Amino acid sequence: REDQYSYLLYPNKELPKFLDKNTISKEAVSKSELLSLLVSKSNKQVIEKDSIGEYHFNGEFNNASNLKQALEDLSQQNEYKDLVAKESKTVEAIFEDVFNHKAFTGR
Amino acid sequence: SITMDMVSMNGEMFYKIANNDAMRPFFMTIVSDSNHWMFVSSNGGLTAGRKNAEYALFPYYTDDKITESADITGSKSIFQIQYNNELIVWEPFSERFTNKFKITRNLYKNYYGNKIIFEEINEDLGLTYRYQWCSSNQFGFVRKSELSNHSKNVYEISLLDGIQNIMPYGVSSDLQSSTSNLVDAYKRSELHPKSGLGIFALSAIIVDKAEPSEALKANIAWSLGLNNPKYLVSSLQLNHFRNGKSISPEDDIKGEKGAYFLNTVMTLEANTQKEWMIIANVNQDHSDIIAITETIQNNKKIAEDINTDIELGTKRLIELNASSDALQLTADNLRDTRHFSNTLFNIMRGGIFDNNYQIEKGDFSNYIKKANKLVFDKIDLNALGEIFSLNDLNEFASKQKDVDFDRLALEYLPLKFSRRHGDPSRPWNKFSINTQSEIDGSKVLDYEGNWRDIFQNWEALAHSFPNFIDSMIHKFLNASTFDGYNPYRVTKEGFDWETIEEDDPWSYIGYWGDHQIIYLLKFLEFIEKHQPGKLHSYFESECFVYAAVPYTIKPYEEILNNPKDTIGYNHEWEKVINERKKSIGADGALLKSNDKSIYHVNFIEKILATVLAKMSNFIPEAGIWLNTQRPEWNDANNALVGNGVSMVTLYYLRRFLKFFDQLLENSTLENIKISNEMVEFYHKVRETLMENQHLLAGSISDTDRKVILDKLGNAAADYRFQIYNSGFWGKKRTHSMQGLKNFTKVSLQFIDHSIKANQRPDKLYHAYNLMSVEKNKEIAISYLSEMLEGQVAVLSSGFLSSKENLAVLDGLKNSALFREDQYSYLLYPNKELPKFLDKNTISKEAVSKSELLSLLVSKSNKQVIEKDSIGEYHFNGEFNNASNLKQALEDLSQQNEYKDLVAKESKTVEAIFEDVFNHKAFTGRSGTFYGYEGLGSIYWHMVSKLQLAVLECCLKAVEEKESEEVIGRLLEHYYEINEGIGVHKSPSLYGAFPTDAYSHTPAGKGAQQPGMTGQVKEDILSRFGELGIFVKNGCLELNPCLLRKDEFLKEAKTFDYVTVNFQHQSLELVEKSLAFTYCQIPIIYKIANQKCIEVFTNDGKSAKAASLILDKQTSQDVFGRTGIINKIEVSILESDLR
Amino acid sequence: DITGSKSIFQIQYNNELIVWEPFSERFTNKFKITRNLYKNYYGNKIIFEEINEDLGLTYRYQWCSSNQFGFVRKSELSNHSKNVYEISLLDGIQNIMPYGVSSDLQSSTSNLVDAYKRSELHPKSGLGIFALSAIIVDKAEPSEALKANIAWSLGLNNPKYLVSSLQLNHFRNGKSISPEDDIKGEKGAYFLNTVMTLEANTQKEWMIIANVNQ
Ligand SMILES: OC[C@H]1O[C@@H](O[C@@H]2[C@@H](O)[C@H](O[C@@H]3[C@@H](O)[C@H](O[C@@H]4[C@@H](O)[C@H](O[C@@H]5[C@@H](O)[C@H](O[C@@H]6[C@@H](O)[C@H](O)O[C@H](CO)[C@H]6O)O[C@H](CO)[C@H]5O)O[C@H](CO)[C@H]4O)O[C@H](CO)[C@H]3O)O[C@H](CO)[C@H]2O)[C@H](O)[C@@H](O)[C@@H]1O
Ligand SMILES: [Cl-]
């Protein structure tokens, strides 16, 4: 670190700005029967479409456990039951692609 | 200097306090129709947010810290003004440039209480800066700014204006309170340059777990009205600007408190005004933010939409409040405004009905589902539409022939808008405004409240919605226990009771002694006035139940032995209730019998349950014994629990039993029907009183006192033991109505006798007494200070004559309860507490005549006693009470030198300790602090209870045609007590806006604790009394005898009201008239030469009569809110006005 | 601004009354000032200094520790001008805690605590006693507060005392104060007020001592 001519513990890095942390690609949504169904039915427990057509995970999620919890909540409805069991690993996988929590080492 | 005026600000009416900075800053709540909260000082310091403290826009701290934070938190404005060749810095509302300029500070709050304006006039520059806080359901908080140049000069101004110490989303109030510095390290404040929108978030939700914790919401701020501003998202550069320097734009700041500042340069021409606004919202996800950024860029009418949504807020507020008769127009706008705010605080705390008597099937059906799974499956609701009335539900219920459904239908109360009453000045109360659904933002029909708070609020509410009175009565009775008490909270679901903590020895439960009689009674009086004969129809109807609260009130001999250790938590009974709740629903918390999963009793049995409980604790000449591990109304005298005795409750029990006695006399029923188990209890109590009647010829001895209490208390103990252990069997027995009347008459004889033994020489009555058990054979009585609560109670009792009532009030006025500076009443005498150096001195004689203390002195031991350097003796400074002393004596006994002496002289040293501290006289913290209920403090709720009591005494004197001297002198008290409440006081004396209620005014400050005090319920009822709104024999009477001539308009005015059908409409009032609403029907009083009433109906007809009493049927058209009556005009004689 | 050291000087200059409040932000850029901070080599003493360049006055206070006596605040008001000033000073410490408040209660419920405060002056000594009317306790039983924090002073001739900050603002606005000996319901403070004539090239000294758990 130049200004103090000493050493950080690990690299400084740019963390994603607020509007850049939680965006699901258009392609990943339209190649998921579950997410597409939740979109067209206006269900916001897992996924939300903003007014410019970009897709986001529910703002209450801190990590995958909140996502799993939410998928359990959906499975106790008949409309979504078949699909939860079918596509849950997939939706968790998209969640991991967006947030990259496999790389988390701590605060 | 400090004046209050009605003023017009941008075409709306506000109260203006001029020079509000000459007042010590006072605390306010700004009300919303939606879920906004805002608690703000008159100096501009604030916390605000939506729903609760977990979604704070500005940090949630206590009111002192809020007031102290004005410089670093909230609104902040700095102007660099070019004047001659000089750069002049002006920072309105701050203390940064003390006496640099001649300034005037003004404060404004609107008639509805949902807008506040802060204004500073810089007299030297002829500039005025204003900002105003508004609420918007859609957009959040809106701060409207105006910079006005009323000089003849033209100024080049560089301004920096905004809000600071903005919370990021996702910080718990506990963490912000205790660890604000750590939170800073997770802050990231960003600007969206295309929009100018500020985003205030965390880099991660702060969590003790070692796992990812994404923060996917934010607080936001944005603005309109300024040309091409520079933005700050922090306060870092604030001081540079303050020192006349220019700032650099910021778009990404880490590790610092959020702020949102706009910087622009402008030329402010003479006699012109520049305007802008800042909008801030909480709890915003990515989609919420993008919608705002899009609206900023694309919606040319966004400012207009904000202003529209603000005005919709006011409109919805008016609809809520108007439905509970908030709207009045008299010559006195202060009283009008106070009635509006009184009503709002009442409905904010107790709730307001959704829509007249209308019910939605979806909500009703879910309610039944949660309540009783078996009723839900059995009862088919096809026959009701999606929306139906209370009368529809009643007609439906009568066809189902299921007493559980009858009960649940009748208890259903479609209340909304209620919330617990916490705030920074009541920080021990956790609040949450849960009025918009987490799902879709739609209305929520739900309520929860503490027993006495909510049933008090509902007494006032019921006046605007009378046909719900039955619902409220069933709710109250059915949530009462078999042993005659109740849980601490009621909810829509049912009720909650307090539980014990850990294995914590100082954690105990119980029952509050005042919760039953007076609050039930106000409802019974109400229904008997509006629907005579209706209570009679419940006498034999076994539709009532018993709340199963798992509290075990101990055997009588154990209570008598230690009346502070009287109620155990029954954990096994809790297991059974929890099982039943898994299996039935909320109805699992009701007592079963041996036959029936739910046990049903009639109204007579329920009245007996509560009355026998009280009579079983009756100590003749002393009152109702307090032995249930909770106090009554005054929590600050909680140490009276044990040996204290309530005359307060006895005065109300007199009123109650007098009412019940009249009720029975009017019955034609010959019999009653009660649980078999209750027969012995009932008979033993009745018999005890009957065979001791003869003692009432004189005073009752201490010996006889105990003979009576023993019989009464043993009888209750036997009953509860049986029910606790083998339950209700389910069989009932038939007894005589005549026996019940006899029980009531003799109970009244004892109560009356007791009241007559409780007058003081100064004509005040005792409130709370002390009892002690002497020689295992006697109960002795001693007395406490004059207490306002006792006077309120005896004046409400119905027992005294008008002359006697007056003598009480003359005494009260002449007593040490009267506080001169506020011309109102303390709860008990102010007194000098010993100064620090005078509290803990042991007499030289007591020391030298104690071998133990003398030995500890000469050996220089300081565990118990210490000698100062001037030879005076003191107890160890660590002692709080005798227990610390005993503990210390145990510590000394484990030494050989002191062992013999501890055993010998310990009772003696404990006795000297009691002589120094006089802890036998301790009643609670009331006598040992200087705010709230304590010394020199006016507790306004109790004053407003006095006012209502005195109003009732005035009506009695008028109705009984007492002399004009007696009536006049009672009115004198009425009007003076009313004035004391302080609606017409100057702001400097009141200490806030006099149109806003506060819980108390201490000796050395103005009004403290704004908003939701129970005071408001009382002042609503008093206002109705004053207006002459009386209901008797099912008939509405509009016939003022206490109303003053000067309330009538002196010029023409327009009354804007809301109909029962949500229509915003107008009536033109003329001089010599005024208007209010009752059951949301507009009522106009006009002065005329002859008495007359005119009822205008929706069919375009009107009907007149000389009589100011309406028939039953017309009255039920009023009470029923069917919209058949459009308005009512009452012609009043000048000579009947005061 | 509200807790700890606080000093306000009313200075007679010509026929005008000038208010100077060193270390505050109450009179921004009213005067050319220099603020200096000193800490000794051992790290057990700190000095706060403000030079008012316009008046040629310097005010210093220093925090020291004493095992016997508690905290010691040594004050020096130094006139390095060629002028002679009639000064009315108000100097002391504010938001003094009373003995017996837990740090958790003061942190979360500071407003409730105010209601139990009683601040007293011992007239013969000038010593301030800062206590509660009762130890604040959730139990329904008596709770005597038999200890106090204290403050006292040496070096000033016949001072008037405040035991609160109630009158602080009147003094700030150039008005004179009334002595206090018994204030209830308010944050404790200990202020000394005296009038003096500060000759050119002279220095006046005093100290305030405060201790806990007395
Ligand atoms: O500050 C310390 C000081 O405070 C004082 O309180 C002041 C407070 O009283 C004042 O409030 C005003 C309020 O009093 C006033 O009420 C009047 C009301 O008194 C009046 O009552 C009359 C009766 O007087 C009359 O009785 C007659 C009876 O006395 C005589 O013996 O026999 C007659 C028959 O033979 C009998 O008639 O009867 C008539 C009806 O027949 C009553 O009406 O009624 C008027 C209106 O009609 C009512 O106004 O109201 C004013 C506003 O309306 C209040 O302003 O406010 C002051 C602050 O501004 C307080 O200071 C205490 O009293 C002192 O003890 C304290 O030291
Ligand atoms: Cl709570």
Q: Can you summarize the main beta sheet of chain A? A: 2 strands, antiparallel
> What is the helical fraction of chain A, as a range of percent?
40-55%
Oligomerization status of the protein chains: part of a larger assembly
Determine the number of helices of chain A (DSSP H or I, runs of at least 4 residues): 4
Strand content of chain A: 5-15%
Compute the separation of the termini of chain A in Å: 20 Å
Gyration radius of chain A (Cα, Å) is 17 Å
PDB class: hydrolase
Keywords: Beta-1, 3-oligosaccharide phosphorylase, Glycosyl hydrolase family 149, oligosaccharide synthesis
Entry title: Bacterial beta-1,3-oligosaccharide phosphorylase from GH149 with laminarihexaose bound at a surface site
Chains A, B, C: Beta-1,3-oligosaccharide phosphorylase
Characterize the structure shown.
- It is classed as hydrolase.
- The entry lists the keywords 3-oligosaccharide phosphorylase, Glycosyl hydrolase family 149, hydrolase.
- The entry is titled "Bacterial beta-1,3-oligosaccharide phosphorylase from GH149 with laminarihexaose bound at a surface site".
- Chains A, B, C are Beta-1,3-oligosaccharide phosphorylase.
- Organism of A, B, C: metagenome.
- EC number of A, B, C: 2.4.1.-.
- This is part of a larger assembly, with 3 copies of chain A.
- With 107 residues, the first copy, chain A, is mainly α.
- Helices cover 44% and strands 6% of the residues of chain A.
- Chain A has 4 helices and 2 strands.
- Chain A has a two-stranded antiparallel sheet with strand order 1-2.
- In chain A, a hairpin with a 5-residue loop joins strand 1 and strand 2.
- In chain A, helix 3 packs antiparallel against helix 4.
- The structure holds a molecule of 6 linked components (BGC-BGC-BGC-BGC-BGC-BGC) and chloride ion (CL).
- The site of chloride ion (CL) has 2 residues of chain B, from loops.
